[PDB]
Design an enzyme around this catalytic site. Structure first.
Site, PDB file in Angstrom:
ATOM      1  N   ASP B  30      47.949  33.138  47.108  1.00  0.00           N
ATOM      2  CA  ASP B  30      46.966  34.009  47.941  1.00  0.00           C
ATOM      3  C   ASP B  30      46.067  32.949  48.504  1.00  0.00           C
ATOM      4  O   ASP B  30      45.175  32.331  47.890  1.00  0.00           O
ATOM      5  CB  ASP B  30      46.319  34.833  46.882  1.00  0.00           C
ATOM      6  CG  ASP B  30      45.256  35.691  47.532  1.00  0.00           C
ATOM      7  OD1 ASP B  30      45.172  36.183  48.855  1.00  0.00           O
ATOM      8  OD2 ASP B  30      44.342  36.101  46.727  1.00  0.00           O
ATOM      9  N   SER B  33      42.183  33.960  47.845  1.00  0.00           N
ATOM     10  CA  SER B  33      41.430  33.723  46.861  1.00  0.00           C
ATOM     11  C   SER B  33      41.711  32.397  46.705  1.00  0.00           C
ATOM     12  O   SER B  33      42.594  31.633  47.196  1.00  0.00           O
ATOM     13  CB  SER B  33      41.938  34.445  45.645  1.00  0.00           C
ATOM     14  OG  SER B  33      43.186  34.231  45.388  1.00  0.00           O
ATOM     15  N   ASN B  35      41.420  30.968  42.948  1.00  0.00           N
ATOM     16  CA  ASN B  35      41.685  30.638  41.667  1.00  0.00           C
ATOM     17  C   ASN B  35      43.233  30.598  40.963  1.00  0.00           C
ATOM     18  O   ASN B  35      43.694  31.614  41.749  1.00  0.00           O
ATOM     19  CB  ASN B  35      40.834  31.403  40.633  1.00  0.00           C
ATOM     20  CG  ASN B  35      39.438  31.337  40.608  1.00  0.00           C
ATOM     21  OD1 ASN B  35      38.643  31.644  41.471  1.00  0.00           O
ATOM     22  ND2 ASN B  35      38.926  30.016  39.789  1.00  0.00           N
ATOM     23  N   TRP B  37      45.153  32.066  37.820  1.00  0.00           N
ATOM     24  CA  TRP B  37      44.860  32.638  36.384  1.00  0.00           C
ATOM     25  C   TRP B  37      46.461  33.342  36.178  1.00  0.00           C
ATOM     26  O   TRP B  37      47.088  33.910  36.998  1.00  0.00           O
ATOM     27  CB  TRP B  37      43.951  33.641  36.590  1.00  0.00           C
ATOM     28  CG  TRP B  37      44.187  34.995  37.384  1.00  0.00           C
ATOM     29  CD1 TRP B  37      43.887  35.205  38.634  1.00  0.00           C
ATOM     30  CD2 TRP B  37      45.008  36.224  37.222  1.00  0.00           C
ATOM     31  NE1 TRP B  37      44.307  36.492  39.194  1.00  0.00           N
ATOM     32  CE2 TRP B  37      45.127  37.054  38.271  1.00  0.00           C
ATOM     33  CE3 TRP B  37      45.750  36.458  35.889  1.00  0.00           C
ATOM     34  CZ2 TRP B  37      45.709  38.076  38.218  1.00  0.00           C
ATOM     35  CZ3 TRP B  37      46.272  37.749  36.005  1.00  0.00           C
ATOM     36  CH2 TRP B  37      46.413  38.624  37.038  1.00  0.00           C
ATOM     37  N   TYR B  73      37.798  41.058  42.755  1.00  0.00           N
ATOM     38  CA  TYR B  73      38.935  41.147  43.694  1.00  0.00           C
ATOM     39  C   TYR B  73      38.245  42.353  44.803  1.00  0.00           C
ATOM     40  O   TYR B  73      38.946  42.947  45.836  1.00  0.00           O
ATOM     41  CB  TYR B  73      40.071  41.295  43.725  1.00  0.00           C
ATOM     42  CG  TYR B  73      40.799  39.803  43.188  1.00  0.00           C
ATOM     43  CD1 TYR B  73      40.884  38.769  44.020  1.00  0.00           C
ATOM     44  CD2 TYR B  73      41.440  40.051  41.802  1.00  0.00           C
ATOM     45  CE1 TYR B  73      41.637  37.561  43.151  1.00  0.00           C
ATOM     46  CE2 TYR B  73      41.910  38.790  41.110  1.00  0.00           C
ATOM     47  CZ  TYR B  73      42.113  37.723  42.210  1.00  0.00           C
ATOM     48  OH  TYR B  73      42.382  36.209  41.533  1.00  0.00           O
ATOM     49  N   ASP B 213      45.144  35.854  55.531  1.00  0.00           N
ATOM     50  CA  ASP B 213      45.369  36.026  54.093  1.00  0.00           C
ATOM     51  C   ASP B 213      47.003  36.574  53.431  1.00  0.00           C
ATOM     52  O   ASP B 213      47.208  37.683  53.807  1.00  0.00           O
ATOM     53  CB  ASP B 213      44.564  37.235  53.486  1.00  0.00           C
ATOM     54  CG  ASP B 213      44.675  37.428  52.013  1.00  0.00           C
ATOM     55  OD1 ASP B 213      45.230  36.598  51.262  1.00  0.00           O
ATOM     56  OD2 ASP B 213      44.217  38.630  51.606  1.00  0.00           O
ATOM     57  N   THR B 216      47.304  39.617  51.213  1.00  0.00           N
ATOM     58  CA  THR B 216      47.125  40.962  51.739  1.00  0.00           C
ATOM     59  C   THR B 216      48.486  41.300  52.596  1.00  0.00           C
ATOM     60  O   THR B 216      48.933  40.593  53.397  1.00  0.00           O
ATOM     61  CB  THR B 216      45.878  41.210  52.965  1.00  0.00           C
ATOM     62  OG1 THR B 216      44.848  40.840  52.081  1.00  0.00           O
ATOM     63  CG2 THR B 216      45.853  42.428  53.508  1.00  0.00           C
TER      64      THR B 216
END
Lengths: 5, 322, 9, 322, 9, 5
Positions: B30, B33, B35, B37, B73, B213, B216
């Site tokens: 992505d 964003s 991070n 995780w 988000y 993005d 998306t």
């Protein structure tokens, strides 16, 4: 060492 | 709440590994964003039971920085603690990479999500907790030959779809790359000169901001502008999505995004999803200020235009996909 | 120059 | 919910350690439960932030059995995963002891609880997940000279209060120990012949079941019977507790519990809490069948009668405390 | 015979 | 070894 591409 | 609702729709996935021995996870790359995780084995929500969950005790190379984390988000927070370990992405292995181990309720719908976590490829300013993003570690650890990565999303049958760290593949795009400067270093944010339908300017006549993005699925924009765009192309409201009569495909108008003076045209064939019926590849999504309002060039756009993300020169490269 | 490819589905 | 509400009132605490190097935790030794659990560093609830939280990655001797867990104390579930590591209790160290690492919301009030976890001392049948209780491991690992432990709860000033694993201290009780058989091996459950007030049988005239529980502050029983007991002794409802006029202490009746034919008398001095005002040491608490109804001889009772818990002969020893 | 004492407060 | 008490 061989030189990378 | 549904913290990951904007990722539950048609996405592309890749696999990564964390720890020694490797623990595999299906993630979404992505650029929206920053991070990384994955679910923690400590997440006991019913929604986490169907996913791969990171087990720290099984990894000899795991360590805890000490800080906890919380990410947003836009539709709910996701929290857990931060961990450090070796993260592998096909061929490369980043040591000491920090990532989040989510524990709190991820959302009922996450139960059937086809991915386990997310690997953000945006700038560090977007990273929560000041955690260094995977790609920044790759650059800092000299794992890539060029400070960039590129994405190819195949429309057919998505077999050949691939992400490339350290460069791009000219066999995925025709002509030379068109470069666009990143206007704000957080998301891969760029400026639109204007958006036109049927060869006529209809939105952002005076320019507006957008982001490229990969996280998306569709092309989004301020909900109000999208409605105007929906009926301009001939889309109609249904249960919750906008459908279009497959037949009138050849009578529908072209949607053009003018970026840095260059026209990026999407024929109705390109902005329409065949997912036996035909629906709109456009959707409303209002990003709140000061970040928004924004237009989001998601997968629908990337499928038509190979995208290159260059951190070395802070720019985006676009060219017709092949 | 090497390219590190990551398949997507 | 408030999962630990029945432990938030006046309790006695001890300290234990888990892992290498040792991680200390303040716990309640509870003969009313059988699991050992402490907050997980993965518990990100505001209520966990004020407590010591177990950090698996900092312990070289930690391992994960693989099973998760969930416990109920009657007012809400507490969940997490099961861990294994060395647990130390003043002088003794159990290796491979399994315990719970709680993650879910422990309850807002837990924020100020003076303890971190609970160490159950009841029978294994009460243990969730079939996890072996600490004391059973102590016996299995031959760490104690006699298959029993005993508790001394000091009323003054609770300085000398102590728990003894492997035996009892005759300096804490006068006369010889009265043994009572355990009727059902789960809680340390026993049978009451009858309960009398002012030397007259008033409850359980035909006998009833009770448990000796260090984890319970007062002496509890079916809420309806307690009300009858409250006004019989002269207690009156207030904000939420039952108060008594300190002055009429010498004019109040004795409350006697007849166990195995022996009278266990509590003078109003013994069943009244000085915590500048005087309140009742009795409270209603309805345990649902098939386990209940039950009367619970909590700390108020134990302070008056040194208690010995013998797993070797499945019995309870009682004698006037000193 | 040894007694393993655990102080309580 | 000494015999314990």
């Amino acid at each position: 060492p061989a030189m990378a591409m | 709440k549904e913290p990951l609702i904007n990722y539950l729709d048609m996405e592309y996935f890749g696999t990564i590994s964390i720890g020694s021995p490797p623990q595999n996870f299906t993630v979404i790359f992505d650029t929206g964003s920053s991070n990384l995780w994955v679910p923690s084995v400590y997440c006991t929500s019913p929604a986490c039971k169907t996913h791969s969950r990171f087990q720290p005790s099984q990894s000899s190379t795991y360590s805890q920085p000490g800080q906890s984390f919380s990410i947003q988000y836009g539709t709910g927070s996701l929290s857990g603690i931060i961990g450090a370990d070796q993260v592998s992405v096909e061929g490369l292995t980043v040591v000491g990479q920090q990532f989040g181990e989510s524990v709190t309720e991820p959302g009922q719908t996450f139960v059937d999500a086809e991915f386990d976590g997310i690997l953000g490829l945006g700038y560090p300013s977007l990273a929560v907790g000041g955690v260094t993003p995977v790609f920044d570690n790759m650059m800092a650890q000299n794992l890539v030959d060029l400070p960039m990565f590129s994405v190819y999303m195949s429309s057919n049958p998505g077999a050949g779809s691939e992400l490339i760290f350290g460069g791009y593949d000219h066999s995925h795009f025709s002509g030379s790359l068109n470069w666009v400067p990143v206007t704000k270093q957080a998301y891969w944010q760029i400026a639109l000169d204007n958006i036109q339908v049927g060869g006529t300017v209809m939105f952002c006549s005076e320019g507006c901001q957008a982001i490229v993005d990969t996280g998306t699925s569709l092309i989004t924009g301020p909900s109000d502008k999208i409605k105007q765009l929906q009926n301009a192309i001939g889309a109609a409201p249904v249960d919750g999505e906008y459908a279009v009569e497959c037949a009138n495909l050849n009578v529908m108008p072209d949607v053009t995004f003018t970026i840095n003076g260059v026209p990026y045209t999407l024929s109705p064939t390109a902005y329409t999803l065949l997912d036996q019926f035909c629906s709109s590849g456009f959707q409303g999504l209002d990003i709140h200020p000061p970040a928004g309002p924004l237009w989001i060039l998601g997968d629908v756009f990337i499928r038509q235009f190979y995208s290159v993300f260059d951190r070395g020169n802070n720019r985006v490269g676009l060219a017709p996909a092949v | 120059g090497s390219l590190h490819r990551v398949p997507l589905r």
